[PDB]
Design a binder for this molecule. Structure first.
Ligand SMILES: *[C@@H]1O[C@H](CO)[C@@H](O[C@@H]2O[C@H](CO)[C@@H](O[C@@H]3O[C@H](CO[C@H]4O[C@H](CO)[C@@H](O[C@@H]5O[C@H](CO)[C@@H](O[C@@H]6O[C@H](CO)[C@H](O)[C@H](O)[C@H]6O)[C@H](O)[C@H]5NC(C)=O)[C@H](O)[C@@H]4O)[C@@H](O)[C@H](O[C@H]4O[C@H](CO)[C@@H](O[C@@H]5O[C@H](CO)[C@@H](O[C@@H]6O[C@H](CO[C@]7(C(=O)O)C[C@H](O)[C@@H](NC(C)=O)[C@H]([C@H](O)[C@H](O)CO)O7)[C@H](O)[C@H](O)[C@H]6O)[C@H](O)[C@H]5NC(C)=O)[C@H](O)[C@@H]4O)[C@@H]3O)[C@H](O)[C@H]2NC(C)=O)[C@H](O)[C@H]1NC(C)=O
Ligand SMILES: *[C@@H]1O[C@H](CO)[C@@H](O[C@@H]2O[C@H](CO)[C@@H](O[C@@H]3O[C@H](CO[C@H]4O[C@H](CO)[C@@H](O[C@@H]5O[C@H](CO)[C@@H](O[C@@H]6O[C@H](CO[C@]7(C(=O)O)C[C@H](O)[C@@H](NC(C)=O)[C@H]([C@H](O)[C@H](O)CO)O7)[C@H](O)[C@H](O)[C@H]6O)[C@H](O)[C@H]5NC(C)=O)[C@H](O)[C@@H]4O)[C@@H](O)[C@H](O[C@H]4O[C@H](CO)[C@@H](O[C@@H]5O[C@H](CO)[C@@H](O)[C@H](O)[C@H]5NC(C)=O)[C@H](O)[C@@H]4O)[C@@H]3O)[C@H](O)[C@H]2NC(C)=O)[C@H](O)[C@H]1NC(C)=O
Ligand SMILES: CCCCCCCCOCCOCCOCCOCCO
Ligand SMILES: CCCCCCCCOCCOCCOCCOCCO
Lengths: 676, 853
């Protein structure tokens, strides 16, 4: 198992040694080895890793995109973090800086004057021009002349002053050095500060590095993509694109990746790495930023479920793709393109296909294996929208998606204008099972719907993480049933469902789901973490099955957070936390269109207003609850609660988090690497 | 003679003879022309040549009546008002003549004469004032057993000049039109939730207010037990049953009052006349929707629990008032109790107001440039006030007036009123002159109208009275606090107070759904000029032709309303060849057009911003050839017609083909999408039976041919021809005494079944995709009925009338009734359910007493 690198310049070929010089420290047998391979250009390196005579090259974002492209599909594995560990500058932010109250938004850039860091640069050129590519005046080739005739005078340093005069109108000559007053990050910002231009395309950090005062920077704002402004200290919520600085990238599926990290991490250690002597990995004796960027402070492993496009981001990928493929609609009608819905199964895909047909094209369809695969498809743009439960709204939100519409179940004249609050997650016990409270819950046998689910796991274990700081809930309760847990765990010691279905998150497991969790309570366990409708749902005869036929709801009470108990109908003063109804989520650039079309769809094929026997009905399914819940009355618009934090509620947010960072979801892990 | 063939004229006398009191009686013996049911007892105009509603124009004295306006339906799964949808019914006691035209007729009646037209002319003083008398007074009073309908009318007319005057008052009260006694007789069952002691050993509680001495510690010694609901089977008459499986029509309470005043003055010369006209008629159609279950059942309680969970206070009750105790989720956040039944009501109020002035110039002898001229100004207003009311605050019942109140916990009320109205300020000039051996009859007609359409949405609110309740931790006594579990020794500590009444306004502003109560106001001006001419070409033929230009401009403050300018051209031509074997070879051609209705202009909306789209008018073309044998036997007339409709307006999408594949562009909108043609046959004759009494014959058969959809449109439901009245035969046999003192008449009517092809179709999608759809779930069977009527007069004074209708008690269901269930029907009935309720009436009697004085 040998790990071959690759170096472009002949200078870093010597920097790549050791090799076996100042790196021959604690070598086992066949493991932590580092070789050197020489190639001409950066392309030749990725083309080499495409074969096998090379394994690891560190690349800038532009080349990370190039390396991802066919035929040589390369995946990012390791990143150079900068600054602190609590504040790692793994990514920077492309940003549009403007003077306060200057009177224009992102979609009003035409005819304004621009300040760039330099032609071809990432934050100062590629990203903003890429994002603007379609709005540019045809012909969009050559690009410089197009940008020049989109703005009313610009300072684009390192560009040709003769062929493209307007691109040097704010800085005659386009100096490619410090000699030009308007060069680089600080230079472009000066072009704004002086009033030469109306907008400067720079890095988020730039204004904080040229304006030490709060009151000075208070005279500036940022343009957000949603056509609003925000103060310069809110770049994380108001940027053109997020971009990875320096990323090392392996050959995807078919090439050592875990060995590369085992190397680079061990290479940190022995500051033979670079914060002791020999040799400081980051700095070079003959050059600057030779093998790695000199600004580096070490390396971090890129999470497993992270592919290139998810790593570079929707905004960046969009911008660069525009810049290369140059494909834009020659008829920019500025109306809504079809909404691509994401289906989680064959039955969902069948219904979606029927919907697509009846919707005369306004809905299209894409499938995926899992919920998280769909969310990722919405993130990268392969899909547009899907309906999600509160739990999956939290993760989708941490991934940059927003909720557009909430599913409503209340019969009311103003249903589509008034989003419902949702339900309550509660803890149910028997009244006979004295003495049970929320305090002395330790050592009792628990009943959960399934591990990872909202009410059955995340919320209750979330409130319990603030008691015992460890993800060993196995050793908190005596035993119980939490479908999906390890087979050798104590949370399977009283499940049912014979075979290998025992402790499996599916109906074959008799204690899976709300119903099963409550059945667990009445038969084996002594406390169920379930929904506030669950107990009435399965008592009185509503559940005709034998185990639940004679059950009475008034035989059960609820555990309150203050250590007391109340009956099942008093959930409003005796719950763990409030959870929201399902919501449709989408990308931010699709919010308006998804909002428009889905509301149109429910007036065409909504609950009533059509004969569900003769035609298509959006809220009816061949089996159960496909795409939307079957008892959906309508889709309601979201005003205040248009963000994941506001849609979920402070109770839900405070409850998890903790249990987060301790979670298993690989999508959450990946999006947490980017924010933060 | 060319003007007018394809017509069907009825006089005031014809009406009184046939004893027509209802709008349905009027075309009862005329196959191919029917009245479209409105859904709640009213009517929505007529149905001719396959089209109905706003596709046949309805006029009174040159003034068009109300358009059928249907507001887009509400989401939310609740009952609402909606617009009336009706067209205003004319008071027949005020009309002299009725002119029904089949086929296109826009040159005569303008926009709306796509498939036909119905024109009424109002009575005058001379229609009441006898030959050699200076005054007169008539008096019709009639009872119709089928709907327990009494109608009373008095007409005063006098002349001293010079000056003349007419005054008519008509009062009508009636009920639901009953059905055949066997259809919908009997008994049916349903469930009703009732209180029962909960069996759980944790169903104990006490209530604070019932602890008159001491405290929880002392009062817990006498707990009360919770209550739960089990439903119980109950059996009621079919008339009293409320629910989906209904056997009888909704109970209707109908009233009509009409005033007509018409003063006039004849000048000198006797060729000048000024005259005014003042009409005010108002009708009320009040029903209760019995399709709505009055009483709550366990099935709906459990349903609510599944969604909302259990409710605080359930099973618990003040005193011994067990019932209870039992309450569940309503709509709009209300809690509704099992001890009240719910009731749903619609109170519709149709008001027509007319004020007009006319100058009339006659001239016979014919020495001036016009033999006849008429200037007229008419201000008309028609209002349809539809007031929905839902109550849940009575034992049924059902009370429409009860309201939620503190003394009535778990009650509910909802109000919703939708008001639609149109106004015309119409100025009409009509000139007429005959030229010459071949005589030309020239006719010009001018028109100017300032008009307005207005929909208001108000009185739209709910009210409930949810009980004051809390379950509390009892005081500490002593040591630490113990939260009770409902056991007999540890009962809950509950307080129960009277209900707190809450009101919620449902109206929103500018949200583009049903709840948008921003008044929809559309205004405009319009012009028409019409030149016609019919010439007598010797005795061998008559030839007529007509030309007309129409302009219309509309405006709305709302930018989303489909607003604009229309200029259409209408023309007609006819010939009547008379080679005179006393037979006439007839052939006529006429165009027809319909401008986008006010409801179509407002467009389809889904709670989001909408652009306005252009809408071209619907157009039609009517070719009709005919032959009539006349003579001593009377006459026998036959005709074949071919009406081709085009640019039919339907809710769909604009379509375009970009890269081989077609696609939808724009929003769901009302667009010109479709064309369709219909052919058919009419036979009409009357025999003299000489012979050496009379007979009538009538037959109609319509067929649908080509249906082509525009290539630039999609999501287009083809066209369900549920409007087409089934093929019908109607023959007659009767005797009139030549003296004119008495008479007898027998009528046999036979209708075919409803053709299943006329209510089947598909919805066009992309690219070759489609979905088959049906108009109704059921079609009607053939049927035949016989009516027998007779009269008797006592020389100019008293004259008695009597008719037995459906003599053979034939039990049948009319198609015009079943139509109400169709997808697309104004105020469509759903979900049926049981079709018994659409049964026609069996044997029924009507009696009329006419007095002249
Ligand atoms: C769908 O569906 C669903 C299902 O069903 C639903 O849901 C639901 O709902 C319900 C209701 O309706 C509920 O229940 C409830 O509960 C409660 C409690 O619980 C709770 O918990 C928590 C707390 O604890 C909460 O939270 C909350 O949240 C909410 C929502 O969001 C909120 O609200 C809001 O907020 C915002 C922000 O800020 C604003 O504020 C606005 O305003 C609002 O809207 C809130 O806030 C919160 N909290 C608070 C409280 O604050 C949660 O959520 C939960 O819920 C309870 O409490 C209630 O109670 C009830 O019952 C009772 C017995 O029956 C009665 O009573 C009451 O009581 C009280 C105490 O005692 C009282 O107070 C009083 O007052 C007085 C005065 O006086 C009077 C006069 O005189 O004036 C009277 C009147 O009536 C009143 N009111 C009115 C309206 O008017 C007044 C006042 O002032 C007012 O405010 C005015 O406005 O007053 C003296 O002064 C004192 O204060 C005292 O004493 C009162 O009165 C009463 N009330 C009445 C009304 O009457 C009643 O009945 C009540 O109601 C209950 O129980 C449940 O839970 C639920 N569930 C779930 C699942 O969630 C829904 O709804 C649907 N949706 C749709 C959309 O549709
Ligand atoms: C807006 O849109 C909304 C949706 O968004 C709409 O709401 C929806 O509307 C639905 C309909 O209203 C609603 O209800 C559903 O209804 C079905 C029941 O089916 C209906 O029709 C039945 C047949 O007519 C009938 O039910 C029984 O039937 C029996 C047998 O016939 C009847 O017995 C008869 O009664 C007579 C009466 O006696 C005599 C008498 O009176 O004595 C003799 C007498 O002489 C004569 N009189 C005469 C001749 O004059 C009469 C006379 O013959 C009769 O009156 C004729 O009508 O009768 C005798 O007693 C004898 O027994 C017999 O002849 C019985 O009376 C009927 N009951 C009633 C109430 O009348 C009803 O009419 C019924 O309405 C419900 O069952 C549905 O619930 C179920 O749906 C699914 C069914 O498969 C199930 O789903 C399952 O779920 C499980 C668990 O998760 C899973 O396994 C699966 O998911 C799934 N399984 C499967 C197989 O897939 C489930 O069981 C569920 O509970 C359903 O509820 C519906 O709820 C809602 N939708 C929603 C989501 O809310 C609404 O319309 C719109 N709203 C508005 C405001 O407009
Ligand atoms: C400026 C409008 C004048 C037109 C009114 C002419 C008839 C006067 O009576 C109107 C009241 O009669 C009830 C009819 O309802 C109103 C109809 O007009 C409202 C539609 O715009
Ligand atoms: C696309 C196919 C859907 C089929 C729609 C039509 C279904 C067949 O209708 C049944 C016709 O029978 C009519 C019964 O109505 C009257 C008979 O009973 C009258 C009682 O006097």
């Amino acid at each position: 198992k040998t790990v071959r690198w690759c170096a472009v310049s002949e200078h870093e070929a010597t920097k790549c040694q050791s090799f076996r010089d100042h790196m021959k420290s604690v070598i086992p047998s066949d493991g932590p080895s580092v070789a050197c391979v020489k190639k001409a250009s950066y392309l030749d390196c990725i083309r080499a890793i495409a074969a096998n005579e090379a394994d690891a090259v560190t690349l800038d974002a532009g080349l990370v995109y190039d390396a991802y492209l066919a035929p040589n599909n390369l995946k990012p594995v390791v990143a150079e973090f900068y600054g602190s560990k609590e504040d790692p500058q793994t990514f920077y932010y492309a940003v549009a800086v403007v003077k306060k109250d200057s009177g224009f938004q992102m979609n009003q850039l035409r005819g304004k004057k621009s300040c760039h860091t330099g032609l071809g640069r990432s934050a100062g050129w590629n990203i903003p021009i890429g994002l603007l590519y379609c709005d540019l005046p045809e012909p969009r080739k050559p690009l410089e002349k197009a940008v020049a005739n989109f703005f009313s005078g610009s300072c684009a340093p390192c560009a040709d002053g003769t062929d493209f005069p307007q691109l040097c109108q704010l800085c005659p000559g386009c100096g490619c050095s410090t000699l030009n007053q308007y060069f680089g990050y600080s230079g472009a910002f000066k072009c704004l500060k002086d009033g030469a231009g109306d907008v400067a395309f720079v890095k988020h950090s730039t204004i904080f590095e040229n304006l030490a005062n709060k009151a000075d920077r208070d005279q500036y704002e940022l343009l957000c993509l949603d056509n609003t402004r925000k103060p310069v200290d809110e770049y994380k919520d108001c940027h053109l694109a997020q971009v990875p600085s320096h990323t090392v990238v392996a050959r995807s599926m078919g090439g050592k990746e875990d060995l590369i990290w085992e190397l680079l991490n061990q290479a940190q250690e022995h500051f033979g790495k670079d914060k002791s002597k020999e040799f400081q990995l980051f700095s070079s004796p003959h050059g600057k930023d030779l093998l790695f960027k000199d600004s580096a402070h070490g390396f971090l492993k890129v999470p497993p479920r992270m592919d290139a496009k998810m790593y570079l981001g929707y905004e960046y990928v969009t911008a660069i793709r525009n810049l290369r493929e140059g494909t834009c609609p020659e008829a920019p009608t500025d109306e809504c393109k079809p909404v691509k819905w994401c289906a989680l199964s064959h039955h969902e895909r069948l219904k979606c296909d029927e919907w697509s047909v009846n919707s005369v094209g306004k809905i299209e369809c894409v499938s995926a294996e899992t919920t998280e695969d769909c969310i990722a498809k919405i993130m990268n743009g392969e899909a547009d929208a899907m309906s999600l439960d509160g739990g999956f709204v939290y993760i989708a939100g941490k991934c940059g998606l927003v909720p557009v519409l909430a599913e409503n179940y209340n019969k009311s004249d103003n249903c589509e204008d008034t989003p419902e609050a949702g339900y309550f997650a509660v803890a149910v016990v028997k009244k006979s099972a004295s003495d049970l409270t929320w305090d002395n819950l330790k050592g009792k046998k628990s009943c959960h719907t399934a591990v990872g689910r909202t009410a059955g796991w995340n919320i209750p274990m979330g409130l319990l993480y603030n008691k015992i700081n460890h993800c060993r809930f196995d050793e908190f309760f005596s035993e119980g049933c939490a479908p999906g847990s390890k087979k050798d765990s104590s949370l399977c010691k009283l499940c049912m469902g014979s075979g290998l279905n025992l402790c499996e998150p599916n109906n074959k497991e008799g204690y899976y789901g709300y119903t099963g969790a409550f059945r667990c309570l009445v038969e084996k366990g002594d406390v169920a973490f379930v929904k506030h409708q669950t107990v009435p749902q399965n008592t009185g005869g509503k559940n005709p099955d034998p185990w639940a036929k004679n059950l009475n709801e008034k035989d059960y009470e609820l555990l309150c957070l203050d250590g007391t108990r109340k009956p099942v109908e008093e959930y409003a003063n005796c719950h763990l936390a409030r959870a929201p109804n399902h919501a449709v989520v989408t990308r931010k650039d699709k919010e308006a269109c998804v909002h428009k079309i889905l509301r149109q769809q429910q007036h065409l094929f909504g609950s009533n207003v059509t004969d569900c026997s003769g035609n298509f009905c959006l809220f009816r399914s061949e089996t159960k609850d496909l795409l939307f819940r079957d008892d959906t009355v309508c889709l309601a618009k979201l005003h205040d609660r248009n963000t994941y934090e506001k849609y979920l509620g402070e109770e839900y947010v405070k409850a998890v988090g903790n249990l987060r960072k301790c979670s298993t979801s690989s999508l959450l892990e990946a999006c947490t690497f980017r924010r933060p | 003679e060319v003007t007018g063939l394809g017509k069907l004229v009825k006089s005031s006398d014809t009406l009184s003879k046939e004893q027509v009191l209802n709008i349905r009686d009027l075309t009862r013996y005329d196959p191919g022309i029917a009245v479209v049911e409105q859904g709640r007892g009213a009517s929505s105009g007529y149905s001719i040549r396959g089209m109905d509603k706003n596709r046949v124009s309805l006029t009174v004295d040159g003034v068009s009546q109300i358009q059928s306006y249907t507001a887009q339906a509400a989401l939310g799964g609740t009952r609402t008002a909606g617009s009336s949808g009706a067209i205003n019914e004319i008071e027949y006691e005020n009309v002299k003549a009725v002119e029904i035209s089949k086929g296109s007729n826009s040159v005569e009646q303008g926009s709306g004469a796509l498939a036909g037209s119905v024109a009424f002319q109002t009575k005058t003083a001379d229609d009441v004032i006898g030959e050699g008398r200076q005054w007169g007074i008539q008096s019709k009073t009639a009872y119709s057993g089928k709907n327990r309908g009494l109608t009373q009318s008095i007409a005063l007319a006098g002349r001293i000049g010079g000056a003349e005057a007419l005054l008519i008052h008509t009062g009508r009260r009636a009920g639901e039109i009953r059905a055949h006694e066997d259809a919908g007789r009997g008994v049916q069952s349903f469930n009703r939730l009732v209180p029962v002691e909960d069996s759980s050993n944790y169903a104990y509680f006490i209530v604070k207010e019932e602890c008159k001495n001491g405290s929880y510690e002392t009062c817990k010694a006498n707990p009360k037990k919770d209550v739960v609901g089990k439903d119980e089977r109950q059996t009621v008459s079919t008339r009293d049953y409320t629910g989906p499986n209904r056997f009888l029509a909704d109970p209707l309470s109908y009233e009509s009052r009409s005033w007509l005043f018409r003063p006039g003055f004849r000048f000198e010369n006797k060729r000048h006349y000024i005259g005014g006209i003042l009409e005010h008629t108002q009708q009320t159609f009040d029903t209760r929707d019995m399709t709505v279950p009055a009483f709550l059942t366990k099935a709906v309680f459990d349903a609510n629990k599944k969604q909302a969970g259990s409710l605080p206070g359930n099973g618990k009750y003040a005193g011994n008032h067990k019932y209870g105790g039992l309450f569940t989720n309503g709509e709009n956040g209300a809690l509704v109790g099992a001890e009240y039944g719910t009731g749903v009501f619609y109170d519709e109020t149709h008001t027509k107001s007319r004020y007009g002035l006319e100058y009339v110039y006659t001239n016979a002898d014919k020495d001036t440039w016009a033999d006849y001229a008429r200037l007229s100004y008419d201000r008309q207003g028609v209002g349809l006030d539809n007031h929905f009311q839902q109550t849940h605050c009575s034992a049924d019942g059902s009370d429409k007036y009860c309201r939620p109140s503190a003394d009535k916990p778990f009650s509910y009320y909802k109000s919703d009123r939708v008001i639609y109205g149109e106004s015309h300020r119409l100025l009409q000039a009509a000139f007429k002159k005959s030229f010459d051996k071949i005589r030309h009859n020239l006719s010009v007609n001018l028109g100017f109208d300032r008009f307005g359409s207005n929909l208001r949405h108000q009185d739209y609110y709910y009210q409930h009275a949810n009980r004051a309740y809390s379950s509390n931790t009892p005081p500490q006594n002593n040591g630490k606090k113990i939260s009770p579990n409902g056991s007999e020794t540890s009962p809950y500590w509950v307080t129960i107070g009277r209900g707190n009444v809450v009101t919620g306004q449902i109206c929103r502003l500018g949200n583009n759904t049903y709840t948008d109560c921003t008044p929809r106001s559309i205004n405009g001006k319009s012009y028409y000029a019409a030149v016609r001419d019919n010439v007598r070409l010797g005795r061998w033929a008559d030839v007529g032709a007509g030309l007309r230009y129409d302009y219309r401009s509309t405006h709305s403050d709302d930018g989303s309303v489909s607003t604009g300018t229309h200029r259409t051209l209408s023309w007609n031509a006819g010939i009547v060849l008379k080679p005179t074997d006393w037979l006439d070879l007839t052939y006529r051609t006429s165009t027809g057009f319909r401008l986008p209705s006010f409801a179509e202009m407002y467009g389809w909306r889904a709670g989001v911003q909408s652009k306005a789209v252009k809408i071209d008018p619907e157009k039609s073309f009517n070719k009709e050839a005919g032959i009539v044998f006349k003579g001593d036997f009377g006459n026998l007339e036959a005709s074949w017609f071919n009406n081709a409709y085009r640019d039919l307006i339907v809710r769909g999408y604009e379509a375009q083909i970009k890269d081989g594949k077609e696609e939808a562009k724009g929003d769901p909108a009302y667009l010109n999408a479709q064309s369709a043609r219909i052919t058919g046959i009419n036979i009409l004759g009357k025999i003299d039976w000489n012979g050496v009494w009379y007979s009538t014959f009538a037959y109609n058969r319509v067929r649908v041919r080509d249906i082509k959809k525009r290539a630039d449109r999609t999501d287009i439901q083809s066209h369900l021809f549920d409007a087409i009245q089934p093929s019908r035969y109607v023959v007659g046999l009767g005797y009139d005494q030549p003296e004119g003192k008495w008479g007898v008449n027998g009528m046999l009517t036979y209708s075919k079944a409803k053709e299943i092809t006329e209510l089947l179709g598909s919805r066009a999608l992309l690219n070759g995709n489609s979905r088959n759809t049906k108009a109704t779930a059921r079609r009607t069977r053939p049927w035949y009925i016989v009516d027998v009527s007779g009269y008797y007069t006592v020389k100019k004074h008293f004259t008695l009338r009597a008719g037995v209708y459906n003599l053979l008690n034939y039990r049948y269901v009319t198609w015009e009734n079943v139509r109400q269930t169709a997808g697309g029907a104004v105020n469509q009935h759903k979900n049926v359910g049981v079709y018994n309720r659409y049964a026609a009436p069996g044997r029924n009697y009507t009696f009329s007493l006419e007095y002249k004085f």
